[PDB]
Design a protein around this motif. Structure first.
Motif, PDB file in Angstrom:
ATOM      1  N   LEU A 116       0.834  -1.200   0.000  1.00 54.50           N
ATOM      2  CA  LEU A 116       0.000   0.000   0.000  1.00 54.50           C
ATOM      3  C   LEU A 116       0.871   1.253   0.000  1.00 54.50           C
ATOM      4  O   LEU A 116       0.686   2.154   0.821  1.00 54.50           O
ATOM      5  CB  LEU A 116      -0.949   0.017   1.205  1.00 54.50           C
ATOM      6  CG  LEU A 116      -2.157  -0.922   1.106  1.00 54.50           C
ATOM      7  CD1 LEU A 116      -1.715  -2.377   1.060  1.00 54.50           C
ATOM      8  CD2 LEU A 116      -3.106  -0.690   2.272  1.00 54.50           C
ATOM      9  N   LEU A 123       1.274   7.900  -1.349  1.00 59.96           N
ATOM     10  CA  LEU A 123      -0.174   7.824  -1.171  1.00 59.96           C
ATOM     11  C   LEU A 123      -0.830   9.152  -1.554  1.00 59.96           C
ATOM     12  O   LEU A 123      -1.434   9.824  -0.716  1.00 59.96           O
ATOM     13  CB  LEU A 123      -0.507   7.470   0.283  1.00 59.96           C
ATOM     14  CG  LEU A 123      -1.797   6.668   0.494  1.00 59.96           C
ATOM     15  CD1 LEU A 123      -2.013   6.396   1.974  1.00 59.96           C
ATOM     16  CD2 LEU A 123      -3.001   7.392  -0.090  1.00 59.96           C
ATOM     17  N   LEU A 168      -6.442   8.825  -2.231  1.00 58.66           N
ATOM     18  CA  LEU A 168      -7.087   7.984  -1.230  1.00 58.66           C
ATOM     19  C   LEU A 168      -8.595   8.201  -1.274  1.00 58.66           C
ATOM     20  O   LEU A 168      -9.066   9.337  -1.237  1.00 58.66           O
ATOM     21  CB  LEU A 168      -6.536   8.311   0.167  1.00 58.66           C
ATOM     22  CG  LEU A 168      -6.851   7.296   1.277  1.00 58.66           C
ATOM     23  CD1 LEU A 168      -8.339   7.267   1.596  1.00 58.66           C
ATOM     24  CD2 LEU A 168      -6.364   5.906   0.888  1.00 58.66           C
ATOM     25  N   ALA A 178      -6.768  10.401   6.043  1.00 58.63           N
ATOM     26  CA  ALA A 178      -5.875   9.255   5.892  1.00 58.63           C
ATOM     27  C   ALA A 178      -4.442   9.600   6.288  1.00 58.63           C
ATOM     28  O   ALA A 178      -3.904  10.630   5.885  1.00 58.63           O
ATOM     29  CB  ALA A 178      -5.918   8.741   4.461  1.00 58.63           C
ATOM     30  N   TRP A 233      -0.446   7.912   6.610  1.00 58.56           N
ATOM     31  CA  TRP A 233       0.457   6.825   6.250  1.00 58.56           C
ATOM     32  C   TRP A 233       1.092   6.204   7.494  1.00 58.56           C
ATOM     33  O   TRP A 233       1.362   6.897   8.476  1.00 58.56           O
ATOM     34  CB  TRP A 233       1.555   7.330   5.315  1.00 58.56           C
ATOM     35  CG  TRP A 233       2.385   6.229   4.732  1.00 58.56           C
ATOM     36  CD1 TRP A 233       2.117   5.510   3.603  1.00 58.56           C
ATOM     37  CD2 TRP A 233       3.604   5.700   5.266  1.00 58.56           C
ATOM     38  NE1 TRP A 233       3.104   4.579   3.392  1.00 58.56           N
ATOM     39  CE2 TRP A 233       4.027   4.674   4.401  1.00 58.56           C
ATOM     40  CE3 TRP A 233       4.382   5.999   6.387  1.00 58.56           C
ATOM     41  CZ2 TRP A 233       5.192   3.946   4.624  1.00 58.56           C
ATOM     42  CZ3 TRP A 233       5.538   5.275   6.609  1.00 58.56           C
ATOM     43  CH2 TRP A 233       5.934   4.258   5.730  1.00 58.56           C
ATOM     44  N   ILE A 292      -2.886   1.639   7.215  1.00 58.56           N
ATOM     45  CA  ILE A 292      -3.264   3.016   6.913  1.00 58.56           C
ATOM     46  C   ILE A 292      -4.491   3.424   7.724  1.00 58.56           C
ATOM     47  O   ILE A 292      -5.568   2.851   7.567  1.00 58.56           O
ATOM     48  CB  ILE A 292      -3.576   3.208   5.412  1.00 58.56           C
ATOM     49  CG1 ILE A 292      -2.349   2.879   4.556  1.00 58.56           C
ATOM     50  CG2 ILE A 292      -4.042   4.633   5.149  1.00 58.56           C
ATOM     51  CD1 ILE A 292      -2.604   2.969   3.067  1.00 58.56           C
ATOM     52  N   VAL A 313      -6.963   2.578  -3.045  1.00 58.60           N
ATOM     53  CA  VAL A 313      -5.786   3.318  -2.597  1.00 58.60           C
ATOM     54  C   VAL A 313      -4.836   3.574  -3.763  1.00 58.60           C
ATOM     55  O   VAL A 313      -4.255   2.643  -4.321  1.00 58.60           O
ATOM     56  CB  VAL A 313      -5.029   2.557  -1.490  1.00 58.60           C
ATOM     57  CG1 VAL A 313      -3.830   3.359  -1.009  1.00 58.60           C
ATOM     58  CG2 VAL A 313      -5.959   2.227  -0.331  1.00 58.60           C
ATOM     59  N   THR A 327      -1.454   4.915  -5.683  1.00 59.33           N
ATOM     60  CA  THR A 327      -0.026   4.950  -5.397  1.00 59.33           C
ATOM     61  C   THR A 327       0.759   5.392  -6.625  1.00 59.33           C
ATOM     62  O   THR A 327       0.502   4.930  -7.737  1.00 59.33           O
ATOM     63  CB  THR A 327       0.495   3.575  -4.934  1.00 59.33           C
ATOM     64  OG1 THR A 327       0.220   2.583  -5.930  1.00 59.33           O
ATOM     65  CG2 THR A 327      -0.148   3.166  -3.616  1.00 59.33           C
ATOM     66  N   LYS A 346      -4.423   2.500  -8.501  1.00 61.17           N
ATOM     67  CA  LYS A 346      -5.536   2.284  -7.582  1.00 61.17           C
ATOM     68  C   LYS A 346      -5.487   0.881  -6.987  1.00 61.17           C
ATOM     69  O   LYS A 346      -5.337  -0.106  -7.707  1.00 61.17           O
ATOM     70  CB  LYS A 346      -6.872   2.505  -8.293  1.00 61.17           C
ATOM     71  CG  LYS A 346      -7.088   3.941  -8.747  1.00 61.17           C
ATOM     72  CD  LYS A 346      -8.428   4.117  -9.446  1.00 61.17           C
ATOM     73  CE  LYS A 346      -8.504   3.304 -10.730  1.00 61.17           C
ATOM     74  NZ  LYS A 346      -9.812   3.479 -11.420  1.00 61.17           N
TER      75      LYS A 346
END
Length: 95
Positions: free
Chosen positions: A29, A36, A39, A50, A52, A58, A74, A76, A81
């Motif tokens: 994740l 990130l 989100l 959210a 990290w 998370i 999520v 990245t 996703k």
């Protein structure tokens, strides 16, 4: 070799209003807070809340329902996703 997209399949609770706290559990994740960038929970955006922690955990409150399942997506930078097999059931606000 190719980095696999963040996989989600874990949750401490299993029922509660959107504002209910829920610990995310999975794999890959994002290995960094900056990574990130995106989100969203239940389609609703909740990046601001959210936070990290690691490449799996998370902390974030599930966003208000919009879709029809409750998939924990999520985003990245390294990947994209995140897909989740599990889904959190949103309960109507207590009042």
């Amino acid at each position: 070799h190719m980095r696999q997209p963040p996989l989600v399949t874990g949750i401490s609770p299993n029922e509660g209003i959107p504002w209910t706290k829920v610990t995310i559990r999975g794999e890959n994740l994002g290995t960094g807070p900056t990574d990130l960038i995106g989100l969203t929970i239940c389609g609703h955006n909740c990046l601001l809340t959210a936070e990290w922690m690691s490449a799996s955990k998370i902390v974030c409150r599930v966003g208000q329902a919009k879709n029809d399942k409750g998939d924990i997506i999520v985003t990245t930078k390294s990947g994209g996703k995140g897909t989740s097999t599990v889904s959190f059931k949103l309960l109507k606000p207590e009042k």
